[PDB]
Ligand binder design. Structure first.
Ligand SMILES: Nc1ncnc2c1ncn2[C@@H]1O[C@H](COP(=O)(O)OP(=O)(O)CP(=O)(O)O)[C@@H](O)[C@H]1O
Ligand SMILES: Nc1ncnc2c1ncn2[C@@H]1O[C@H](COP(=O)(O)OP(=O)(O)CP(=O)(O)O)[C@@H](O)[C@H]1O
Ligand SMILES: [Mg+2]
Ligand SMILES: [Mg+2]
Ligand SMILES: [Mg+2]
Ligand SMILES: [Mg+2]
Ligand SMILES: [Zn+2]
Ligand SMILES: [Zn+2]
Lengths: 330, 201, 201, 332
């Protein structure tokens, strides 16, 4: 079969910690008073939940309410445990209270409110230093959850809140987040299509924290090259082809043969042969002010087929791309 | 079969009450209506169970300009009549039967309503219904009463009824409608934001 | 003739909208209903245009406990369906036609209403009607809709509708009912005195 | 020969010299004020001619009584509205504040000052002797004014005199049947309450004067000091005179008829019969004993007379032993 793979950093964290941590199924919920919340405005909604802007009438502050539908009785326990374990962490969204409808038993999460200047009209207004700054903020958060033995598995611009007014960044949406157990296999139907790691596209169930680092790379590329999304695919097949046309087909088969991955026959029929293009190719007169030799080098070490050969969150923070940022913390 | 009993027994005229004998016979209560309704004596004698024009070509022709002009008279008389203590007592009796209907509002709990006109001027508005519990006017349920002038009931009939009979004023609703979405209340700011969004087309 | 189109085409079911094909075919949207409706697969396959039990087809001990148990299922499915963006769009289209009716209140000026349940629990309350202008619930005009569970529409359907579509929120009434007796207004003290008199029996 | 003419003893020629913009109410115009300043609160009463409401003037937040006049007669409305203005400010006379009307139906409405009337239904059985002497002197104080102004009331009854015992306040209302007095001119005999109808109204004598109110005042006095409301309880305009004839006697009745050659209706003398004049000391028992005095009976005896010309005037009545304890208590 396939060749086993384990995480380089924070490999054994859940395999020594008390079971009242990585075992979210045996966890219980501290259900608070729901009547303290009144809906005001719909911020968004999706397949799993509806999200509202609400006002906590007890303190007259603005609170965001996330209403979880009865999807899976263990998935709800997963996000609620992770949110509490990462609670108080750097750039991690704050779970305030966990209420539920006494009639329908449908639970609802409430969070702190971040006046998000939406990135639909923000990523085209960011400068070079701004991109370097917020990227360092995500790493500051990604390194924490990875150290806590928790993968995010859904790193996307639609799941990172930015209040440019106060230079505030928060990472949200921890529904797809999961604890990391070494050797144990996971599901490959996670994360956004445009941010799916190569391991998820070739059905490699034994991934680790490095999955988020790929998603982070796609974000960086989409920002510094002004192309959202960068790897614009149409399915889980065309997606890898989109990647193969950039990273080359040369290193792809090397990634497969290294782990003896049982590749789906439909791939090699449509993969063809693509040479590895330079990162200096996607640079034009618009994104030129965002691209630097350090930026390309950092991105080049982020987007790799081999998850084991990708930069870790701490390693990524120790990069020339984040020199102007760290030195400005005096 | 008399005229008054026939008219009030018709379909769509369940709101009407039968005016007493001596109230129309007393010419003190009919003044100021001469140049207000066409063919006064024709409209009067017809509803007063009197013989028609004895020698003038009895052939009705289009008495729709006479018979439905007699309906106009009795309607206006009914407006003055239901303000009197006798008239109110008759309406209050129909009120106990529920001839006028019940309040559409859920939290009024089927409170029986009273007939009411928005205007005392004929041909300006149709008859409405006043709920003494929620104190607002409504459009009649059935389509029957959608062709009856509100001027035949007046604007102050239900008002003057509780003036003379304050004991019939219902206790204000113990409950009200509270918006619940997924178990949550709705902050009033929500409705303010929607109105601002509505003013953008 | 399908099942969904037939049921929604029935008299008294003008409030219902036809649920899309794949929404019921998607078993992700039907969870938690197994021990909530009797004869689950019987209720499911019947509305999904599937063949019967294959054999004992004659009504399995009076299919009024099966067919009207299939009505129970689709009703609950309709509640979850009209909260989705697709379901709302269908109801909003019926809203433009006025399939639900208009507000009984006179000073709402025939504002088209939305269906609403007072409770999300079946057999506790019938379907009501929500006017987005006066923001109160009313009892349906016709007697047809007086036999339809409100749990098949939910308590937060009209509320969540204007959450995603705030542009459809009507401007609050420009006019209101003002009591006029002989041309005079009525001081609020009048209603207070009548209530005190009413509390004396 | 018809009936014998009769003229008023006091204030005989007042309207026959005054400017015509006084007794001629038909050529009078109304100062219609803003109606929207009034909101109804409680129905105080209503009758054949008008509805009466208690209202609050929202401009000054005070209590105001609204009298809504129905379109009865386009000259009757002009009559009460002129008299109320002519007597406005007078002693114990009700005050006409404003005259509004419904702009839609043109139905006028009068507003008056509010008098917290401790209703006489439960008051006339609580009054003492001095109280009766006091308020009776107050009515005379008002009746002498309108009579001096050449205005008969023609409707003096307990239901038309407002009394606020709290502040010892008395006001005379209901001036709809009130009419200016022209000497020699004949009037209508279908006025005033049945129990307070003067003998001249019962025998169809159209030429009466201010003295009509003095008879009605006597009926009030008798009903109060003898504890009998009403005193002359009749059933029609025929039995009423019979009720009076059984007390004042039939002796002085025919003398009143023959004096003025009154064309008496044939039905009367058939049912009148013969009644002797009973004493006023006859209607005194253990209940009304504390209200009856020799001065009270003497005053009442001079009030209730068949001959209107021989009845006490309002000023003459005030100069009576019955009102000695009252006048002397104004030394302040
Ligand atoms: N703290 C906050 N301040 C302002 N908006 C917030 C917020 N927290 C969450 N939001 C809103 O949450 C929305 C995203 O919701 P969320 O990602 O939790 O839904 P979801 O995870 O169920 C759908 P999917 O899994 O497909 O991404 C964002 O559009 C944002 O507007
Ligand atoms: N100033 C005042 N303060 C309190 N109540 C007053 C008032 N003025 C009038 N009222 C009310 O007016 C009522 C009498 O109304 P009014 O005498 O004017 O009617 P009316 O003359 O049309 C009937 P009728 O001629 O048969 O007596 C009394 O019952 C009294 O309560
Ligand atoms: Mg999300
Ligand atoms: Mg999510
Ligand atoms: Mg009176
Ligand atoms: Mg009067
Ligand atoms: Zn009501
Ligand atoms: Zn409405």
């Amino acid at each position: 079969g396939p060749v086993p793979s384990r995480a380089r950093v924070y490999t054994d964290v859940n395999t020594h910690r008390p079971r009242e941590y990585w075992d979210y199924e045996s966890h219980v919920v501290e259900w608070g008073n729901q009547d303290d919340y009144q809906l005001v405005r719909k911020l968004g909604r999706g397949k799993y939940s509806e999200v509202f802007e609400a006002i906590n009438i007890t303190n007259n502050e603005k609170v965001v309410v996330k209403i979880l539908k009865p999807v899976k009785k263990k998935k709800i326990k997963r996000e609620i445990k992770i949110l509490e374990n990462l609670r108080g962490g750097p750039n991690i969204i704050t779970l305030a209270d966990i209420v539920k409808d006494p009639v329908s038993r449908t639970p609802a999460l409430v969070f702190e409110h971040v006046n998000n200047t939406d990135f639909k009209q923000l990523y085209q207004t960011l400068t070079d230093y701004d991109i370097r700054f917020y990227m360092y903020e995500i790493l500051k958060a990604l390194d924490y959850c990875h150290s806590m033995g928790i993968m995010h598995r859904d790193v996307k611009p639609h799941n990172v809140m930015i209040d440019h007014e106060h230079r505030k960044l928060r990472l949200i949406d921890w529904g797809l987040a999961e604890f990391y157990h070494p050797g144990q296999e996971y599901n490959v139907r996670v994360a956004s299509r445009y941010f799916k790691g190569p391991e998820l596209l070739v059905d490699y169930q034994m991934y680790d924290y490095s999955l988020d680092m790929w998603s982070l790379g796609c974000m960086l590329a989409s920002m510094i090259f002004r192309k959202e999304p960068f790897f614009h695919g149409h399915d889980n097949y065309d997606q890898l082809v989109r990647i193969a046309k950039v990273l080359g087909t040369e290193d792809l088969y090397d990634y497969i043969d290294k782990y003896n991955i049982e590749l789906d026959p439909r791939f090699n029929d449509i993969l063809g042969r693509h040479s590895r293009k330079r990162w200096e190719r996607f640079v034009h007169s618009e994104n030129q002010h965002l691209v630097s030799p350090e930026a390309l080098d950092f991105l080049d070490k982020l987007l790799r087929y081999d998850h084991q050969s990708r930069l870790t969150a701490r390693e990524a923070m120790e990069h020339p791309y984040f020199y102007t940022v760290v030195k400005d913390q005096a | 079969v008399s005229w008054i009993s026939w008219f009030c027994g018709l379909r769509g005229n369940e709101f009407f009450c039968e005016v007493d004998e001596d109230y129309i016979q007393d010419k003190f209560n009919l003044t100021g209506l001469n140049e207000q309704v066409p063919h006064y004596r024709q409209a009067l004698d017809m509803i007063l169970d009197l013989e028609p024009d004895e020698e003038l070509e009895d052939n009705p022709n289009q008495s729709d300009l006479i018979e439905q002009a007699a309906e106009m008279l009795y309607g206006l008389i009914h407006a003055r009549y239901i303000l009197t203590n006798r008239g109110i007592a008759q309406m209050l009796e129909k009120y106990q039967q529920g001839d006028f209907g019940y309040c559409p509002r859920v939290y009024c709990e089927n409170q029986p309503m009273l007939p009411i006109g928005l205007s005392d001027i004929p041909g300006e508005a149709m008859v409405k219904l006043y709920c003494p519990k929620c104190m607002d006017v409504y459009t009649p349920k059935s389509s029957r009463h959608h062709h009856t002038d509100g001027a035949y009931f007046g604007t102050g009939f239900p008002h003057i009824l509780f003036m003379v009979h304050p004991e019939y004023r219902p206790k204000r609703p113990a409950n009200q409608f509270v918006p619940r979405l997924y178990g949550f209340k709705i902050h009033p700011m929500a409705y303010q934001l929607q109105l601002q969004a509505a003013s953008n087309f």
